[PDB]
A paper describes a structure:
HPP patients exhibit hypo-mineralization and osteopenia due to the deficiency or malfunction of tissue non-specific alkaline phosphatase (TNAP), which catalyzes the hydrolysis of phosphate-containing molecules outside the cells, promoting the deposition of hydroxyapatite in the extracellular matrix. Several proteins enriched in the matrix vesicles supply sufficient phosphate for the crystallization of hydroxyapatite, and among them, the TNAP catalyzes the hydrolysis reaction using the pyrophosphate and organic phosphate esters as the substrates, such as pyrophosphate (PPi), pyridoxal phosphate (PLP) and phosphoethanolamine (PEA). The catalytic center of hTNAP is comprised of the catalytic residue S110 and three metal binding sites, one for Mg2+ and two for Zn2+ (1 and 2). The calcium-binding site includes the acidic residues E235, E291, and D306 forming strong static electric interactions with the Ca2+ ion, as well as R223, Y236, and T305 stabilizing the local conformation of the binding pocket.
Crystallization trials showed the crystals of purified hTNAP could grow in both acidic and basic pH conditions diffracting to about 5–10 Å resolution. In both structures determined with hTNAP crystals grown in acidic and basic pH conditions, four TNAP dimers, i.e., protomers A-B, C-D, E-F, and G-H, form an X-shape homo-octamer stabilized with the molecular contacts among protomers B, F, D, and H. The TNAP octamer is maintained with four major interfaces between dimeric TNAPs. Two pairs of dimers, A-B/C-D and E-F/G-H, first form two tetramers with a large interface (interface L) comprising residues from helices 1–3, 18, and 20 via a series of static electric interactions and hydrogen bonds among H79 and D25/D31, E35, and H78, K38/K45 and E311, S364-S368, and T366-T366 from the contacting protomers. The tetramers A/B/C/D and E/F/G/H then dimerize to form the octamer with two small interfaces (interface S) comprising H7, H14, and some loops. Interestingly, multiple HPP-associated mutation sites were mapped in interface L and S, including D156, K264, A492, and C497 from interface S and Y28, E311, T366, and S368 from interface L. The crystallographic analysis of hTNAP has uncovered an unexpected octameric structure that has not been observed in other previously reported AP structures. However, the disruption of the hTNAP function resulting from mutations on the octameric interface implies that hTNAP may be stabilized by octamerization, which prevents the interfaces from exposure. The conserved catalytic residue S110 was solved as the unphosphorylated form in all the protomers, which serve as a nucleophile in attacking the phosphorous. The hTNAP dimer is maintained by the static electric interactions between R71-D458, as well as the hydrogen bonds and hydrophobic interactions among residues such as T68, T85, K99, T103, Q106, H341, Y388, T389, R391, D404, N417, S445, H454, V382, L414, V447, L449, and R450.
Author numbering:
A (entry chain H), C (entry chain E): 18 to 501
B (entry chain F): 18 to 500
D (entry chain B): 251 to 376
């Protein structure tokens, strides 16, 4: 639209010198002890996803979008993360999770273990386990929490508590009899047994907690929502039994219970809101399911009781699933939800004593281009047709995935379809059932004490070593050491 | 102008429904406990001032201005404060400070005393003192802070610690000899003697602390900055004296020393950066003098340590002095600068355990308006000339004050002057040396625990009672009472 | 002065702690459904106007004044409303009316249209009309009412029913030929044809309803009171012709009629008491014309019948006119007369099911200062002389307007004059024929169901969105949905 | 009323009690009281040899619950114990009262030694 104020050189100069003035005050570094440590993991939030979601957030307020500032954009310090596994060039959700949560890079498909463990071979698990910053935080006396929109035993959350040779071992139902007889236990089982005093556990995965064929609380008639546990354990009951009886340990499963709890009285919370993954925010039930921001708000309110501090791992995890489905409007709307949650966390904590970190585990082959005009809808079309085949194309286009569509030898004239639809899959170069990850680097967004330590291009496993050093937990305690 | 997005009704409906969604979420009331408690006092910051200052803040960013949100515009809960003194319909600086700091409306010219005290007569003081929320805080073990751009013995800060019968009694130099014989202590003396453990004091009033005719450190070449105490006392030395010798106390006086400091290393701070009032933000020295925002930051950084919390009183003073001179550009810029401090203070603390309150003591006869178009500069003119004298007029106009100019029965043709100047005095109806206060109500902005308690039209003395009830301090502490 | 009881700190400490006690019981929030909605619009009654009126209401009782509690002061919840137009920093009576009645902000000089409409251009109206809460009420079966002391086709009441590109088109006599040819119609015609079953219409503007040169029913000899319509329509008859005949439709024009009527017996009321505006409360004929409070009670009693509820827009209309004239005593008495009608409405309705809002469209450049002693007459003098020219001045002073009076050189020595007169014009800084509006925010007062939804600093158009949510009318009916 | 003043200064989410006879002392749950005011006589308490077993506690009985309360704080505690009627016994020249007042404080020193640890508690007797 070319806003009138942007035609004036003084506007951009006044703004740049205002940005310059702030950077100069940032030289007075925040070097306090990080009493609280919060980590936002945008599953699949590549660099192209961040800019696309930024334009989306602004366009939801009838603005052009590109000048809009995300809550994560306002974070002072930015760095780049090399996301590769030791096993693979284009990484996976599990191996990266061990990197940025345990400080050690590992093979794909393996949470909580090193590269000495071979995937699916469990006779190689003993002696190769690496602990997470969530365990270091608990050992230091802090409260710990896990909030996600996927299964609570998914790859990204499981690295904070489990040590497994395969990400697919959700419960014993999905394990091979070799690994079970060899003595290895499920991510779900390890959720209630490895660290038995995790204060807040919220997300999906209700079915991996109950004996096989037990009907769900929400969807009683759905056969695919029934329990899976073949050993007959009520893991939700195992959870309650491991906590002392004078403590208030609740367990909830819908939105009404979460917003009714008084955080000042609940000591241990377990919230499981869907049988598997949770609905996309564009598909969420406002009556029965809480948003990711609503879960983050209550979690921080409970974890704040501890005088020693708290660690919180928040995962806007369904950004990754939306990209795999080739549906950008879903994945983009998942990112804006996490950014709203990031803004709520910044409201409930102070930068003086809380180090918050926003990053991803890896990217996707998602792009948007085409020389679109200023303020063009991120889901809209390019302003011109193809030189080659004379049909239009959307700004958003994928490298691969299910978006590949040829209407009989020729690719699809998209002026006939709803490319702005919630479920529209933009076209790709190579047809696959699922769009694949990307090998490019991701950003890291840091605010709080010692946030300036995440400064350049870094191996992904560097992230948790900074957060632990700032909180005086884990191996290096030199930040709380007396002299200097 | 008309932005393109505002021509679409869906924009205004989308905006209102987002606001309606946030209003519904606010039903989940914050009933926590105010571990910390911050009050921002905009001196003379009436309703007309906050709107013009909001327009100014946005206009600094090349936006029209009316659509800007101030930092205080983002506080959830708003109320109106009836500002009248018990003996003054249009109130003054001191008697209001007793209302919102002590909970008792008082007489004009008095601080820290009830209406039984009479001005300038001292044998009405004893038995009539009232204690303040700063005293109520320290008595409950919290830390306390006083940050301001006026003198630390100015009327508004003085009601935190002192109990004086005349606000003019800055040092003993400014007292009548009758009042000395009655055995009454000036405000500057009272700062270092009633609450002997105020952790953070920052502002002006340097020359009321040094002995008479003693040269000032920053302006030695000038004598109006010289010391004023006939006491021959040294309250800087005296300040340092009531702190435990093993605690870290500093005393600073320029900007370099302020940022040089390690807040994690200071227990008691005293900054006096000018002999009297501090220089307007529009006239401040970058090199030698700090801003209000800078002072609020390190103040909170020092006060954050106390495990039982702190109370902080920031006074964005000199908003009042700007209107008193009729120089609206200075008063508005002082108001914008206090809003930067509200922003910094909002980030260094959490709304979950810190109740922050923003208000004024009284207003001014400051108006603006000439059916000016959208985006018109707040210091600009109306679109039309006068239909009475065919001359232009500025959007900003004062009730009274020194802006009254008449070139012999002829009101000043303003197109011949720089009305956008920093020191321009917008025209007024009645000429005076100083523009007067205004008796109309002021706004109250609150966020944090029990901030919803400041809900409607309240007597000004009701403000500190709420902040007292939330922190579980003072004469009533039933908020922490397991019922 | 100092009242005796206020010398005791116990009096302020006790009075405050009783206010705290009430504010603590206000935590249990009224969440019932707004069966009735009542909006009070003090036209031009800004923050400084309400305080001066508070003093006046108390000084008419021989009390000091500042300690008076207006009926609106007793309202629990106060908010601030940003009043600017899309077109104007300092807004007008019409564009603001579209904001707080239609929920959309508009240009100055227009009613019931979005900002896409340009003033005085008729071909810019079609497609850009926006409806009012008075229509959302009627579409929900509620009864609707309009009570005012200005013309019924003035800017403020006409936003509830009209859609025009110019507030100035009172009757067809006032519109340009191009506007008539282009299809659109004058406001008075719209009052009878847009929504043709408005239950109660009261106020002035009688001369716009009858054909041209028709002698007024009151002033047979006054020329200017003759009718104005070139159409030829008798709009009082057109009003009668639109009602169902099994209902009782009464047209009245004087006070005796108004109090003759039996409310529980009349279904449609159109009362037009003056040719133009109504007289000020101070200049009001005690015999021929009714007070605003007398109109509010008769209006309510007729509107309580409908079991589904009612909506009622009341307008203290002549406050704006009083400030425009520089007559602070007239504007302040108009405000006090509206406040009496507020308390009148609080006794005939219950705050359990009736949401009542009192606010203003904008402000004026009206001030009062001078460090006046406690109890000083609001129309009185400042204690000191002007330290510059030795002559006294009143507490009340204006920014601009016709109060400016330099007597061939110096400004007027006001000890020689009548500064407490009904029609005295306090001195101003800039001379104008009419005093202008203020750009400052105005106050919102709310009592009743969901009155707490107006809490902080809000855009003006947010106000009807709240009233329409509590009343379960308009676009969003989520308050009556099966939830909590 | 300084007993009232003592109560008023305490935040009332804490448990403050105030007691005056021995039955109230031995009934308290030390795990449940944060602030305790125990004033058992108008003037000085009686000598141990003259103590009333039912209305008045011994020095050890007071020291035991005093330690039990002070231990709840994770940061530690300071406790001052005065077997201060030894002096009054010597002033009267009644050595049998003074020595019995001394033996009672030694019994208290033994009880304090059992409720704390040499590894983290410093005890001075003088
Ligand atoms: C959310 O979960 C709560 C707790 O299970 C549900 O509340 C129960 O509802 C059943 C009826 O379905 C009642 O018999 C129980 O007494 C309720 N329990 C309590 C503690 O109130 C609630 O219905 C669920 N809401 C939704 C939308 O599923
Ligand atoms: C792509 O599809 C669009 C419409 O589906 C085609 O454009 C329209 O074709 C119809 C039929 O001839 C015309 O009446 C319209 O004027 C055309 N334009 C529009 C904007 O609707 C377009 O030709 C197709 N392109 C290709 C390469 O198949
Ligand atoms: C700010 O204050 C400090 C403290 O007085 C100044 O530093 C002093 O500088 C003089 C000479 O330059 C030395 O003799 C003092 O010993 C210094 N004092 C300290 C504590 O270092 C500093 O120069 C001042 N800065 C400005 C800009 O006025
Ligand atoms: C107010 O002063 C301005 C000039 O400062 C007058 O306007 C100018 O008058 C001169 C000669 O009369 C013209 O040459 C200019 O073109 C005028 N316009 C401007 C913008 O300078 C104006 O007439 C004065 N007003 C009154 C009432 O005397
Ligand atoms: C109010 O208006 C009514 C109606 O016009 C007047 O009442 C009628 O007046 C006519 C002649 O003036 C009489 O023949 C009728 O009998 C009257 N009707 C009633 C019901 O009284 C009335 O005079 C007006 N009142 C005032 C004070 O002007
Ligand atoms: C303003 O007008 C008043 C009244 O006309 C003047 O007050 C009177 O002044 C005369 C002498 O000038 C005295 O004899 C009277 O006693 C005064 N009136 C009262 C009520 O005391 C006043 O002097 C005029 N002031 C100016 C500056 O013109
Ligand atoms: C020790 O003190 C307690 C508490 O005052 C006494 O118990 C009270 O006894 C009186 C009369 O026997 C009753 O009216 C009260 O209700 C009792 N209060 C409680 C809390 O039990 C007790 O009698 C005292 N014992 C001695 C020996 O003095
Ligand atoms: C682990 O067992 C599998 C088969 O059970 C075997 O193929 C593999 O070599 C074994 N590895 C080790 C280290 O024992
Ligand atoms: C969620 O709330 C919005 C509010 O308008 C509504 O439109 C939508 O239908 C709701 N969806 C669900 C699943 O409750
Ligand atoms: C002190 O107050 C008394 C009030 O009874 C008054 O009479 C006396 O004059 C005052 N002191 C002086 C020195 O005036
Ligand atoms: C303060 O800094 C600004 C930054 O550009 C500069 O323009 C101004 O001249 C400086 N003023 C002083 C007094 O240092
Ligand atoms: C509106 O009407 C005028 C009058 O002829 C015409 O010139 C103009 O083009 C019209 N514009 C629109 C947008 O209808
Ligand atoms: C209203 O009636 C009273 C009492 O008869 C009378 O004094 C007064 O003059 C009447 N109103 C007017 C405006 O005259
Ligand atoms: C209690 O006092 C009585 C009377 O002197 C005494 O016989 C007894 O030994 C005392 N001690 C007890 C009962 O433990
Ligand atoms: Ca659910
Ligand atoms: Ca200085
Ligand atoms: Ca009449
Ligand atoms: Ca006893
Ligand atoms: Mg995952
Ligand atoms: Mg002051
Ligand atoms: Mg109007
Ligand atoms: Zn992933
Ligand atoms: Zn993936
Ligand atoms: Zn003041
Ligand atoms: Zn002042
Ligand atoms: Zn108006
Ligand atoms: Zn008007
Ligand atoms: Zn002795």
């Amino acid at each position: 639209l070319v806003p009138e104020k942007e035609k004036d050189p003084k506007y951009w100069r006044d703004q740049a010198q205002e940005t310059l003035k702030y950077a100069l005050e940032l030289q007075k570094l925040n070097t306090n002890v990080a009493k609280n440590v919060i980590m936002f993991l945008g599953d699949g939030m590549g660099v192209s996803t961040v800019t696309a979601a930024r334009i989306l957030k602004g366009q939801l307020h009838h603005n052009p979008g590109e000048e809009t500032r995300l809550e994560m954009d306002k974070f002072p310090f930015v760095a780049l993360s090399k996301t590769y596994n030791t096993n693979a060039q284009v990484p996976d959700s599990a191996g990266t999770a061990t990197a940025y949560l345990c400080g050690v890079k590992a093979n794909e498909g393996t949470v909580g273990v090193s590269a000495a463990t071979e995937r699916s071979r469990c006779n190689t698990t003993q002696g190769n386990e690496v602990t997470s910053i969530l365990r270091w935080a608990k050992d230091a006396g802090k409260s710990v929490g896990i909030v996600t929109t996927t299964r609570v035993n998914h790859a990204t959350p499981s690295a904070a508590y489990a040590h497994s040779a395969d990400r697919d071992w959700y419960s014993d139902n999905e394990m091979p009899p070799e690994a079970l007889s060899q003595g290895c236990k499920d991510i779900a089982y390890q959720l209630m047994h490895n660290i038995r005093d995790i204060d807040v556990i919220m997300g999906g995965g209700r079915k991996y907690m109950y004996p096989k064929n037990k009907t769900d609380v929400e969807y009683e008639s759905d056969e695919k929502a029934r329990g899976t546990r073949l050993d007959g354990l009520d893991l939700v009951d195992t959870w309650k039994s491991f906590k002392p009886r004078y403590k208030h340990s609740h367990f909830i499963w819908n939105r009404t219970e979460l917003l009714t709890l008084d955080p000042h009285n609940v000591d241990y919370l377990l919230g499981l809101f869907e049988p598997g993954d949770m609905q996309y925010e564009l598909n969420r039930n406002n009556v029965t399911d809480p948003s990711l921001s609503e879960m983050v708000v209550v979690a921080i309110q409970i974890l704040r009781k501890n005088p020693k501090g708290f660690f919180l791992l928040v995962e806007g995890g369904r950004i990754d699933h939306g990209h795999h489905e080739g549906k950008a409007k879903q994945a983009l709307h998942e990112a804006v939800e996490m950014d709203r949650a990031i803004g709520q966390a910044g409201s409930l904590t102070s930068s003086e004593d809380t180090l918050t970190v926003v990053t991803a585990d890896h990217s996707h082959v998602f792009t948007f281009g085409g020389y679109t005009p200023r303020g063009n809808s991120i889901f809209g079309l390019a302003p011109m047709l193809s030189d080659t085949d004379k049909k239009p194309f959307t700004a958003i286009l994928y490298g691969n995935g299910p978006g590949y569509k040829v209407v009989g030898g020729e690719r699809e004239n998209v002026s006939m379809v709803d490319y702005a639809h919630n479920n529209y899959q933009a076209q790709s170069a190579v047809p696959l059932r699922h769009e694949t990850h990307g090998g490019e680097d991701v950003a890291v967004f840091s605010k709080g004490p010692m946030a300036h330590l995440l400064h350049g291009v870094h191996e992904q496993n560097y992230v948790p070593h900074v957060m632990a050093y700032a909180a005086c937990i884990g191996a290096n305690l030199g930040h709380c050491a007396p002299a200097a």
